[PDB]
Amino acid sequence: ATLKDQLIYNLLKEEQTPQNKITVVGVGAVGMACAISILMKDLADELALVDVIEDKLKGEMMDLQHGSLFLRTPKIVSGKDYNVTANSKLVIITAGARQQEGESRLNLVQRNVNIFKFIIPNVVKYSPNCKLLIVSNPVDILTYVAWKISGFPKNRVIGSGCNLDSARFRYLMGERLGVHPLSCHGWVLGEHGDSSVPVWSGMNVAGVSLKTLHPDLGTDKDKEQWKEVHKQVVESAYEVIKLKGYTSWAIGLSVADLAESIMKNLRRVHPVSTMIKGLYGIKDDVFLSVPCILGQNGISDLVKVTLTSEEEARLKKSADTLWGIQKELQFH
Amino acid sequence: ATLKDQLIYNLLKEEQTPQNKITVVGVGAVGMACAISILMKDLADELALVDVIEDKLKGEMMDLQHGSLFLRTPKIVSGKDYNVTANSKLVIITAGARQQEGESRLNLVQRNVNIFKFIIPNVVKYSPNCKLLIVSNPVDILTYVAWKISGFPKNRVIGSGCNLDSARFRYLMGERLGVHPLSCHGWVLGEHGDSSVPVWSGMNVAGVSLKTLHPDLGTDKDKEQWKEVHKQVVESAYEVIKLKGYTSWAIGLSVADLAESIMKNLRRVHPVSTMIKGLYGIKDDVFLSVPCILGQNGISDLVKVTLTSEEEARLKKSADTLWGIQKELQFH
Amino acid sequence: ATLKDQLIYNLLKEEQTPQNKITVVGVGAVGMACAISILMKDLADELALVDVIEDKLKGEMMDLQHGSLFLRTPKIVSGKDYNVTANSKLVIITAGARQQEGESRLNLVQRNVNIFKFIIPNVVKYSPNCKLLIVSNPVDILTYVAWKISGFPKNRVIGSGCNLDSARFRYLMGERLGVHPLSCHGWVLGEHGDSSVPVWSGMNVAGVSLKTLHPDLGTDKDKEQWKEVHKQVVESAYEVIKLKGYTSWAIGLSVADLAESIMKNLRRVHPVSTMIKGLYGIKDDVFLSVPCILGQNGISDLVKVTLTSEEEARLKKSADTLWGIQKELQFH
Amino acid sequence: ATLKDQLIYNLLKEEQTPQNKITVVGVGAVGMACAISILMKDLADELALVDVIEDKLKGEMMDLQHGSLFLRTPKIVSGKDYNVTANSKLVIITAGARQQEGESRLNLVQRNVNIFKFIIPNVVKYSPNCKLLIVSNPVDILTYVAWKISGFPKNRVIGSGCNLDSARFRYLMGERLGVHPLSCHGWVLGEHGDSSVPVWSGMNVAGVSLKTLHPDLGTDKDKEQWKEVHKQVVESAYEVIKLKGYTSWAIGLSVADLAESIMKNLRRVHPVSTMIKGLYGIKDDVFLSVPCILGQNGISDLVKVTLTSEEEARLKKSADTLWGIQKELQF
Numbered sequence A, B, C: 001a002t003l004k005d006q007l008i009y010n011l012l013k014e015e016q017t018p019q020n021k022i023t024v025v026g027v028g029a030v031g032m033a034c035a036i037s038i039l040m041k042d043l044a045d046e047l048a049l050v051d052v053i054e055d056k057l058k059g060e061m062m063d064l065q066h067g068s069l070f071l072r073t074p075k076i077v078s079g080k081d082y083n084v085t086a087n088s089k090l091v092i093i094t095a096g097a098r099q100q101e102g103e104s105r106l107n108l109v110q111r112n113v114n115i116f117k118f119i120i121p122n123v124v125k126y127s128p129n130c131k132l133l134i135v136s137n138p139v140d141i142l143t144y145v146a147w148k149i150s151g152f153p154k155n156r157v158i159g160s161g162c163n164l165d166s167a168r169f170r171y172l173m174g175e176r177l178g179v180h181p182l183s184c185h186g187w188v189l190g191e192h193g194d195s196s197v198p199v200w201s202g203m204n205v206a207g208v209s210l211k212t213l214h215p216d217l218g219t220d221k222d223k224e225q226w227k228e229v230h231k232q233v234v235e236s237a238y239e240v241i242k243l244k245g246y247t248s249w250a251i252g253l254s255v256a257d258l259a260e261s262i263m264k265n266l267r268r269v270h271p272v273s274t275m276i277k278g279l280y281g282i283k284d285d286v287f288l289s290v291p292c293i294l295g296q297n298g299i300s301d302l303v304k305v306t307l308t309s310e311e312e313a314r315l316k317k318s319a320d321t322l323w324g325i326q327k328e329l330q331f332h
Numbered sequence D: 001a002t003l004k005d006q007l008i009y010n011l012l013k014e015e016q017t018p019q020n021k022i023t024v025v026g027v028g029a030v031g032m033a034c035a036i037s038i039l040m041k042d043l044a045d046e047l048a049l050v051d052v053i054e055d056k057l058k059g060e061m062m063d064l065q066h067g068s069l070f071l072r073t074p075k076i077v078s079g080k081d082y083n084v085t086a087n088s089k090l091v092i093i094t095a096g097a098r099q100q101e102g103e104s105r106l107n108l109v110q111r112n113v114n115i116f117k118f119i120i121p122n123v124v125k126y127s128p129n130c131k132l133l134i135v136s137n138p139v140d141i142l143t144y145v146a147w148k149i150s151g152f153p154k155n156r157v158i159g160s161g162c163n164l165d166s167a168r169f170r171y172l173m174g175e176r177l178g179v180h181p182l183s184c185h186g187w188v189l190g191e192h193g194d195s196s197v198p199v200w201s202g203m204n205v206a207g208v209s210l211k212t213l214h215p216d217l218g219t220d221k222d223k224e225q226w227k228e229v230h231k232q233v234v235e236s237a238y239e240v241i242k243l244k245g246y247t248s249w250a251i252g253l254s255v256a257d258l259a260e261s262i263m264k265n266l267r268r269v270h271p272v273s274t275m276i277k278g279l280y281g282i283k284d285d286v287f288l289s290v291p292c293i294l295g296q297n298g299i300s301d302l303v304k305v306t307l308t309s310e311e312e313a314r315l316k317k318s319a320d321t322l323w324g325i326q327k328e329l330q331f
Ligand SMILES: COc1ncc(-c2ccc3c(Nc4cccc(C(=O)O)c4)c(C(N)=O)cnc3c2)c(OC)n1
Pocket: A025, A026, A027, A051, A052, A094, A095, A096, A097, A098, A099, A114, A115, A116, A117, A118, A119
């Protein structure tokens, strides 16, 4: 008569699979910052952690487990073996190759490709109907990589993309205006990183367009040098890395948000990295960031935004550049 | 006018004084875990980070800010100068002195004293009605230190104590019983240490005593070896640290729980560390963990747990030890 | 092409399968009070109302729908037809028979059987895998009813039972002690209503038995008349009804909590009305509240509270009372 | 030795002003949806219910109290005396006259006035530093009336105005588009009710104007009749009423949100009835809804919307109309 029995009468052995599970691949700073942000936005009923640093993984699982009482996520798990990811709704990939000192962009991508050849097939093996959210950098390329390898349909392979840059862009637009980032509205689209496109037209507060009111906005003659708000957005990760080593907190929150729209099927619009062949006179299997309706099927629809002849040509080059790398990868 | 000004008539510029501010001191893992935890329970309208490493500090401020859009906490600030702490409701001290290979228990506490000699009277100079939460270890003794230096009354100086220690005890209880830890109950009391006292008299589910059910519970002849659960409670920071380098996430979640009860005036009972001279035959100015009613003036009352002679001795000895260390500190 | 198709390019034909759908039968005060508290606890990706009063139902639906902007539950639907309930995980029944002055108690019960005859098989026709939460009164009979009619296994039919009663009990207990109900513990078990049993043994704060401490607790010699804390609990429903005409808000929150546990698979222990034929020397086919663990599978296990042969006697006499009514009900 | 004595050692007390206290005047369906909606978004530490029906008041208070276990708002107090409202950071008024079959516009607001000379003075008497949120009934005037009687700075007297109207417009915009309301943007401003102006120019998703993408949007010669959405916005409260009796749920969540902005100092922008003596022609003391930044100081700044001469001149007339009533009042 063990105590667990004396105390509790079981009605029902049954039960196998969980309902709203989320896997986070790789437990870096970014990894865990996603993990804590997801825990505390009560988005999953089971959370799986995967990496290859066996002892680190186990530590992060334990540390989180011990705060269980203060959370409404009842089962947390880890393992170097992907069987623990089984039946995930959403699977977030933060894992990748750490940059070497001399290393070409291609090599870094390729070594990411060779990693993704182990991870992505294992993810889809165990969670064949999952949506894949790629956070790893360079994200617009690695999203492609994980698309190619998974063979998931485009709607189920989503890049963190510019969801964070747009978040920074609004934070900073807010600082200037004395307004909360929620009420400040602006979009950074295209290649995540150095050559992203800050869409000045679609900036506004309460619906009164900044570009209309200030025609010179987003340009060199711009008395108010609003083009420097873009630059802060691009310089951001770097000046934060230079300051503290990495980014983590905002990326975690940014991803948490994305998972929320996916997990609760909210059909909100975020700018994420997605397969924009055909759109904007781009002809290659290339992922770029564009305002997308996220929900339980991942990206169900995407918003055709009006870019200038100018802003269009940016995305073109971003994608020529991208394909220029993408076509030298080795999958077989 | 500017763009700001043709879009936004100003009705009145006004000196805001912050209404529900929370300062966090030290931005190590425990530092930031407490801040990310607090940020996401929306417990404050202004967070202030303070440390001595300006570059690190400032990175963390920005990386927090950069997901301001995802948060309902509109002002985040950081500085090395304690004026950024102005008007805090609750100040949380994670900061301290870093142990030195062969350093002595007491010498370590004295460097802690010196640091608190700077940190504390600055904190009180700029938020003289604040509550102090001491998270920094050795907790029970450093809570005494900040009380003695702050000149605050015993109710506004609070140690993070065994609040976490008990949360672990309940996680573990939970995983053994198959019940959420919200619904498994148990109290780890006394020195947040190896000496921590697992009160078996109290362990219940749904108010059914585990002791009256299986009276070997917590004893050497206990075939279910329930004592191990406590051992595991005691050795967790060690096992986690060994596995991941530090601990953070549980302690952060735990502190935010206290922050909730304090900031939200809840009057829940948590096991924190407070002055308990008088109780359980304790005679000296010592601090230990005892179930406390927490609310907006910190500790208003504290629950009188009944203890077996052995348990009472444990606590007394705990206090004997701690007075032992406290009595060779040097303040002035 | 229309404006919509201009703006938004779609990718996927929305299957539109709903994941965490909840339905509310009856849009009473209680029905909406559940609906609104569920919407505010982000527990569903689709809510469905169903009642016979059509002009009313549509109105409630349209109003909830209008606050859509401040909720994260993207699809709220209503209908005379139970076809809208389809794919519900949880179906919460508030519907029932409005009492008639002079009617026997048996008839009222019977009229309720007679509308569950229409409701329940309509609910299981469209959502064969759902969990039934019965809130309707008398709740322990109508659970037996829904259970018999549904033919669902016992674990997927749950009475609202004495969940609320214990929340009142805890509330009141806290009043006296000066503690939040969260930290005051005590369990009210058996038949929801005049015969419900306060289990004094299990009353505690922090792990300390009030019953041990004050062994008179809840007899009549009790200088503190703690027995009144029960009577206030039973007469609370009546007392509110006399003052505003019904209760809605507390029962609302109480049901949102049951839902949370079920929908999030928390396995927290709630005192809900389940089948207890087998325990407490009951050999009928009766539903009474007992502390149950609540999961995605409904009631998975249940706690075996130790009762004084007195407490047992009431429970047994409740079950006769109840069966003697139940055995007279017409069903086919 | 009481049980308390044996269980709880008691430390010395210090005093205790409540720290984030919200009071709701009027426990009608609107009042109470405001009450529960605030309780669930954990915006207060004290909630005060006040009205004149006193049996009802105490019943609603007990009922909320019994759910205390499921909330983190540890004091709910009610009463017919306005001392229960003391130290309210935010006080939300729903009380007011109820129009009768016979009544005209001008008599109903003169009564609202008289009821307000009882309530408003009493609210300030015990919480002189509150922000009045007027939900009342006929808002853009009663907000004026609270402002005049309280004697408070224009910023601390805020009408719900078209806050709710905009959320209804966003829901509907939402509908046609296949997009959550959070990600749909559009604004209804001015006289809450029949005269509310849907700023077609400002309608968008992801910053792409609809007026620019489909130039007959919201005009009469519109193929997919988008004007109907804004008809529907004025229709809805006056249509649900038809269907259910009153409106509650949406108004509650609307107010709650304004409460969140106020109580946490979000400086989020909200279309609220504020005193726009200075814009659009309006050289008159009137409140109308325009987008405003709600901080902890009430309405701290506002947004100057560019408007079609059609839109300007509707507000202009909204404001003429309102001053035409307001001038005939007396205090
Ligand atoms: C033969 O099967 C097998 N098993 C494991 C791996 C493998 C390689 C790298 C991995 C990986 N990254 C990693 C591992 C080692 C070095 C580096 C680096 O920075 O170069 C990066 C991660 C992660 N968290 O980023 C996670 N899992 C990995 C897994 C692998 O190769 C990709 N192949």
